[PDB]
Amino acid sequence: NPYLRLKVRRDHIIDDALVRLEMIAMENPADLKKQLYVEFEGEQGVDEGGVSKEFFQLVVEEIFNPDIGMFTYDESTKLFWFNPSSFETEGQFTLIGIVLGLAIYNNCILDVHFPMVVYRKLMGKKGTFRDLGDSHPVLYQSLKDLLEYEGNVEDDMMITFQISQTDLFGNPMMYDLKENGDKIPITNENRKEFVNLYSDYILNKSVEKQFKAFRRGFHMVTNESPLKYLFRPEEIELLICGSRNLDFQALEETTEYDGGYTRDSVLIREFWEIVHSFTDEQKRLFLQFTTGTDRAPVGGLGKLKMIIAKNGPDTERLPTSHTCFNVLLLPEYSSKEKLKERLLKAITYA
Amino acid sequence: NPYLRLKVRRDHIIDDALVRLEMIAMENPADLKKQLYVEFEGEQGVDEGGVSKEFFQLVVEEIFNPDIGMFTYDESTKLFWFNPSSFETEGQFTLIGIVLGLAIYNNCILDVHFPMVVYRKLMGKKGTFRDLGDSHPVLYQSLKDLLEYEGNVEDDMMITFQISQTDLFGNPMMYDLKENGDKIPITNENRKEFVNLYSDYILNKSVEKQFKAFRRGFHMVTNESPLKYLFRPEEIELLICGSRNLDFQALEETTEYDGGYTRDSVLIREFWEIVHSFTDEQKRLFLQFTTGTDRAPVGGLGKLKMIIAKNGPDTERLPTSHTCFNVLLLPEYSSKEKLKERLLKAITYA
Amino acid sequence: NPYLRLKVRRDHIIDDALVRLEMIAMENPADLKKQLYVEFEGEQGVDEGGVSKEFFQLVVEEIFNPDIGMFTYDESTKLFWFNPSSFETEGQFTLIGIVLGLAIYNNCILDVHFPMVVYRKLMGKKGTFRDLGDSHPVLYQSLKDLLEYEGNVEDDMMITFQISQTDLFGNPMMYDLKENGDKIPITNENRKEFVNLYSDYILNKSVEKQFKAFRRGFHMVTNESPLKYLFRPEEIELLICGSRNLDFQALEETTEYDGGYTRDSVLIREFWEIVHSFTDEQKRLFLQFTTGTDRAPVGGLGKLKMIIAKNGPDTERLPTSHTCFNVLLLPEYSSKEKLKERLLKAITYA
């Protein structure tokens, strides 16, 4: 009944994960929406959610890593987008999809960055011209200009229903967006149609396969859930990435201590005095630093169950952390001022 | 055919749009589920939501203008209720119905102010006594007083089940809440029945016509994904009016500049410093001055994609704005102190 | 019949509510799906939500009172758990179950503190080992330590599938987690099963009867309407217990007065200057003093519609309040220093 249970070995997380999830989904599709328990082969210690969280961080890291070539980063927008060229990776997309779902069912928030269109497509919708704004700003401006051109296309701008599709070392791939997209020039009359097709390409046709497998994954989990009724894509984004809540009161509550600290410690009582006087940008930095993100789960920061463990006597070492357990490793410094200097330099340098 | 597309001309908005949306119902009524694209006739410009937003603003403005007689404004609650008298308007209601629908699939929040009962009736519920508290303060007090009277009603009040519905000229038309209200005095025992019948008429019967229309319209652009998963009337009010989130950081992000401003600029930085140090009260006056409201869209303020453009050298002119584009025309003043002075006076003067 | 309507006399709330609800349940049970209208006998006075609120406070208070012995309190977590030995109380559990349900539709929050496991069980999900962590902190640690032990369970912890269950005055109750738990020693191979079964019994089998009644009561008010499909139980908790918003601006708007105090009054304006400064730790206390909790309903503090009534001329008493209506009886002090000094002592003394 309850209990999902995934046993995967680091080194093969993705393969192992996938394989198990495909069987479970085959046996009881519902088991995919239950309380997740991850276990790394050969490593003991009950998963209180921290393991499952590391499981998520790890999968997310491999997938968006350029190495595997599944997504492309936009230095500009700071968002990934499927790489149309990803080949023989149906399984990984199926997995990153499953994981996004599992992440929604366990109050776990991933640090993923897709353009609104990825969620919009996950809502069964087609990417359109307006959607081009976030995914491909550059391209969108051109189509915008072309659209808003006052002169006479054709004789001015000589373009057809053919478009380029390069690969790493150039080599465009003159794709026809329409039957004979060679001799059908773009006119102040085609442009409208040209743009909507150029847009349907890029956002949809261009990336099916990769995206088809991606949704299949998200759907093995989100099938039959309040997701079918969500309105805007931001709602799915909130479910996956978290809100921008900022309690800290509540975060202070539910904050446990290990290594001999306890709620009453000059170092702890000082920590909070400091943290609360923090500016929000600083509070969000601390969060990134101690957790995988700067956002909050469903219920707020208090649901993060942070742990401030001692990490040596006074020193100069910067406080470190384990973002999968939300554990702040804090060396018991001699002064509030030192704690403050050392904490700020630690989270701003991250 | 991406987009819904509404080609309408100012100086004939409500009609035209009603005529298109209607016809869009006479054919593949699916389109209503798509992404709205408004186009004012004559005017050339790609709708990136700014034209659409204006469509909404202008519409909402007329529909609630006393002139068109569809709604009445409660000077005190600053809310609007349906007008039992507006007949021959059973299409203009079906219109805001659509507009409210559309506004939910667009993260464009409206400037609609309905007493909770409207949303309650939309979720499919009957209006009751308690609802009068906001929709009819004064009426509610009278009925609350009737029920709470400690003396002997009948031996103290000359009222029966025949209540009046009065003109705009002082002419009353008797209306019987029950079989033969003329006789049949209200007693300490009927008063409840009386209050319940007087409330049912006024919140349900008296405006069945205009509401049903409003319901249909809302129903035309959202069907199937009802307010299922929305348990409180308040949840629907947010979808249409935004939350009271006030992120600002994030609003600072996503903010673009124009006319030579850029993220770096003494003025632009003095602005943020100022805006950030703004009391929440002020912060709300500014969203209202720059956007059509003090509320926030799904996803926080950052989704406003606000724009701040330079508007000539240090003047005395107070800044200005095009709410439908979230653009803040800011004169390149000669000082951070002058910016704050002119800005505040401008946001408080609107 | 607009409302549910529970006419009950104090001194007999649990009993009267139960009888009336048992009648409403028999006759058109529909009433169970209408907004609650409470009437304390012999106390004429429209229930504007105030009465309902008091009714909840009294019911929750009585039901979670150590006297009736239905729930047990954990002083570490400050949470309540079902008492497995709460024998002839099947009707009370239903009542408190019916309350939580109404809470879901009332923008009035119940200050009920349950381990997240309760709300998962309400969604028809069985509790799990991880779930204990909150309901049974110490038992959990044991089982965890049991599972993490690197030694040799048997010749180290000598234990079996027979656990010990006590009653008010010691005297365990050797419950067999398995067939003849007597002679099946827990080993490094059993413990997983031992721990599952132990976690199962406790959260599920152990409270079966009492929780079944509880769930039923909840179910009576929340039929079909998903709540069963929500992604996270915390979503059910929020609806019932409120979030942690702290608008105050907004709480200042919507705030009404009585007994002379008009929106404008040096004493009134002096009030907002004090509160608006304050610390959001004091602001949490103040909120706890005037209303039940420091949490806000759907929408924010503004929804609380707090009332500031003048409680006689300048005295030396501490301002007082009726939490059921979020009413702060404020004596018209001789300055804000009095005001500010009196209030601060009140909220930190009540």
Curated annotation (Swiss-Prot), chains A, B, C:
The modification Phosphotyrosine is found at Y140. Changing F194C: In AS; uncertain significance. It is linked to Angelman syndrome: A neurodevelopmental disorder characterized by severe motor and intellectual retardation, ataxia, frequent jerky limb movements and flapping of the arms and hands, hypotonia, seizures, absence of speech, frequent smiling and episodes of paroxysmal laughter, open-mouthed expression revealing the tongue. This is Ubiquitin-protein ligase E3A. It comes from Homo sapiens (Human). Changing F231D: Disrupt trimer formation, 50-fold reduction in E3 ligase activity. The chain holds residues 520 to 869 of 875 of the full protein. The keyword Protein biosynthesis does not apply. It is found in: Cytoplasm; Nucleus. One of its GO terms (biological process) is rhythmic process. Phosphorylation at Tyr-140 by ABL1 impairs E3 ligase activity and protects p53/TP53 from degradation in (HPV)-infected cells. Its main location: cytoplasm. Transmembrane segments: none annotated. The active site is at C324 (glycyl thioester intermediate). E3 ubiquitin-protein ligase which accepts ubiquitin from an E2 ubiquitin-conjugating enzyme in the form of a thioester and transfers it to its substrates. Several substrates have been identified including the BMAL1, ARC, LAMTOR1, RAD23A and RAD23B, MCM7 (which is involved in DNA replication), annexin A1, the PML tumor suppressor, and the cell cycle regulator CDKN1B. Additionally, may function as a cellular quality control ubiquitin ligase by helping the degradation of the cytoplasmic misfolded proteins. Finally, UBE3A also promotes its own degradation in vivo. (Microbial infection) Catalyzes the high-risk human papilloma virus E6-mediated ubiquitination of p53/TP53, contributing to the neoplastic progression of cells infected by these viruses. Keywords: Biological rhythms, Cytoplasm, Disease variant, Host-virus interaction, Metal-binding, Nucleus, Phosphoprotein, Proteasome, Transferase, Ubl conjugation pathway, Zinc, Zinc-finger. The keyword Cytoplasm applies. The active form is probably a homotrimer. Binds UBQLN1 and UBQLN2. Interacts with the 26S proteasome. Interacts with BPY2. Interacts with HIF1AN, MAPK6 and NEURL4; interaction with MAPK6 may be mediated by NEURL4. Interacts with the proteasomal subunit PSMD4. Interacts with ESR1 and WBP2. Interacts with BMAL1. Interacts with ARC. (Microbial infection) Interacts with HCV core protein and targets it to degradation. Residues 257-350 form the HECT domain. GO terms for cellular component: cytosol; glutamatergic synapse; nucleus; postsynaptic cytosol; proteasome complex; synaptic vesicle. A cysteine residue is required for ubiquitin-thioester formation. One of its GO terms (molecular function) is ubiquitin-protein transferase activity.
